[PDB]
Structure 1
Amino acid sequence: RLELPVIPLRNTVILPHTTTPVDVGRAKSKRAVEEAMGADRLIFLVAQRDPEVDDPAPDDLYTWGVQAVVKQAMRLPDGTLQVMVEARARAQVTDYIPGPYLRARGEVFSEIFPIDEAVVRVLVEELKEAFEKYVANHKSLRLDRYQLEAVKGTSDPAMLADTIAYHATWTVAEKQEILELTDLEARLKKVLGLLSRDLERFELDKRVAQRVKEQM
C-alpha cells in the first residue's frame, strides 16, 4: 500500500489466516515492530530467505507478500521483539525501498480464488486425515497434539490448508512456495504431496534405523 513495514523474517513462514510469530535478531529490525504499532498493527510482511545479509537488504524479498493484523504484541526491548501476526491474504510485492530498515509496497488483499469449494472442503477433510496420519507418526518432530486440536470447527478451507502447511516442518523453500501460489486448490495438492514426502522420509528413516542396527 503505502510502504507498510516489512520485518526481516527469522526462518519463519507466514500464511494467510494462520497465527505466526515473528522475532528480531538485530538492532536494525527493532524499529519495525514499533512502526507497526504506529501503523495500527496492519502490516505487509514479505518473506526473506534463510539467514540474510547481516544488514537488512531489500533483495531477498519474494514476488508475493501477505497482509497481516497483529494479534499478540509483546514488548521485549532486549534484542528480540515477539510479534504474533494472523495474516489476512497474500498480495503482490510492487517494489522495494532500500533501508535499513527495508520497506515494500503491496496490493489489496487477494480476494480472488478458484471455486468448486465443495471439493475443496472434501479435500480439507482428506487433508485432516493426512495430517492425523502425519503427526501421529511424526512424534520425533516434537510437535504437540494441540496442533491437531485446532482443525476442528474449520469455517474456511484456506485457513486449515495454511495451518497444516505451516504446522508440518520441512524446508522453508517449500513452505514459502506454498504461500507464493495464488491458486487455492493447488495449495492443498502441494500440501498433500509434501506431507506424503515427509511420510516416506519417516518410513525410510525407520527402515535405515533397523538396517544400521542389523549392520552393527
Structure 2
Amino acid sequence: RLELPVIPLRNTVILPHTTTPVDVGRAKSKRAVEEAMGADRLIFLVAQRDPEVDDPAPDDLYTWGVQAVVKQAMRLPDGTLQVMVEARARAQVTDYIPGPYLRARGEVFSEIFPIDEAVVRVLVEELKEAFEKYVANHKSLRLDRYQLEAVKGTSDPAMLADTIAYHATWTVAEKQEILELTDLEARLKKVLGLLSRDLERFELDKRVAQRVKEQMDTNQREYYLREQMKAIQKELGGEDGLSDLEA
C-alpha cells in the first residue's frame, strides 16, 4: 500500500491469521527484510512463481498479495533471517516497480465478510467434519493430527478457514487460488471441493489396491492351472498321437 517490501513466498502462501515462517535465501529479499525492519514492521508478501529465478523477475509476481504484520524476526545473519508472519488479510497488488528489488502497492485490509454467520458456522462445522474424514483417511500424504487441535475452540471463521486450507496440504497454486477469493462463503466450497477430489483419489487408491491383489491371484493361479493341464497332457498317450507326416 505504501511501497512496502516484497518479501517473496518460499513454497508457501501466507493466509490471514495463521503462523507460517518466512525466511530469505538471497540478499535481494534480505534487503526487503532490512527495510521490513526499517519501515517499522508492515510488509507486503507477494507470491512468486514455481521455483523462483534467482533474481525476482517481473514474471514471478501474482495478483493477490496478503497483508502481514510481522510477529517475530530472528537475526541469524548469514543470508537467512526468520521473519515470521501471521497475516491480517489479502489484498490486490496494484502495480509493480521492476527490480531488484521489486516494489508493490496493495489494497486496504479485507475486513468484509458476509452476513448469516449461522450458515457460515454450519459450513465451518461441515468443513471440520470433512477435514476429520480427510486426515483420518489421508495419513498417506504425511499429514498431521495436531492440525485438528488448531481448529477446535476458536471463534474466528477466517482463521478457521485459513487453518483448514493450509493444513490440508497441496501445491502453492491452489493456496493462491484460495488467496484469490474475497468471500468467506465460497472459500470453504473451494476447500471442500479439493478435499472431496482427494478423497476420490483415495477411493482410486482403494480400487487399484483391490485390482493389484486380483491380478496377483489371477496370473499366479493361471500359471498354476496351465502347468496342471500340461502335466496331465504329458501323463497321457496323446504325447504319442501328435505325429502326422512325422507319423
Normalized against structure 2, the TM-score is what? Answer: 0.81
Shift of 1:205: 2.3
CA contact (8 A) 1:21 1:85 kept: yes
1:46-102 CA deviation, whole Å, 9 max, x = no partner?
112211222112332222211001122222222332222111011121100111121
Larger radius of gyration: 2
Identity %: 100
Cα separation, 2, equivalents of 1:68 and 1:215: 73
Shift of 1:190: 0.4
1:155-192 CA deviation, whole Å, 9 max, x = no partner?
11111111111111112211111011112111110011
For residue 109 of structure 1, what is the aligned residue in structure 2?
A: 109
Range that drifts further, 8-17 or 206-215 = 206-215
Shift of 1:36: 1.0
Specify whether residues 180 and 212 from structure 1 end up closer, same or farther in structure 2 by C-alpha distance, changes over 3 A only: same
Specify whether residues 209 and 113 from structure 1 end up closer, same or farther in structure 2 by C-alpha distance, changes over 3 A only: same
Specify whether residues 52 and 119 from structure 1 end up closer, same or farther in structure 2 by C-alpha distance, changes over 3 A only: same
1:20-58 CA deviation, whole Å, 9 max, x = no partner?
212222222222222212222211211122112221123
Shift of 1:215: 21
Cα separation, 2, equivalents of 1:79 and 1:67: 24
CA contact (8 A) 1:10 1:50 kept: no
Range that drifts further, 87-96 or 14-23 = 14-23
CA contact (8 A) 1:7 1:45 kept: yes
Number of equivalent positions: 216
Shift of 1:207: 3.0
Look up the SS of the partner of 1:193 in the other structure.
helix
CA contact (8 A) 2:69 2:88 kept: yes
- Can you give the 5+ residue segments of structure 2 that lack an aligned partner in the other structure? 214-226, 230-247
Which one scores higher on RCO, CA 8 angstroms, separation ≥ 6?
Answer: 1
Cα separation, 2, equivalents of 1:200 and 1:7: 36
CA contact (8 A) 1:134 1:195 kept: yes
Runs of 4+ in 1 over 6 A off after TM superposition: none
Cα separation, 2, equivalents of 1:98 and 1:42: 21
RMSD: 2.9
CA contact (8 A) 1:58 1:103 kept: no
Specify whether residues 123 and 215 from structure 1 end up closer, same or farther in structure 2 by C-alpha distance, changes over 3 A only: farther
Cα separation, 1, equivalents of 2:228 and 2:139: 25
Range that drifts further, 51-60 or 178-187 = 51-60
Look up the SS of the partner of 1:61 in the other structure.
coil
Look up the SS of the partner of 1:152 in the other structure.
coil
Normalized against structure 1, the TM-score is what? Answer: 0.92
Look up the SS of the partner of 2:70 in the other structure.
strand
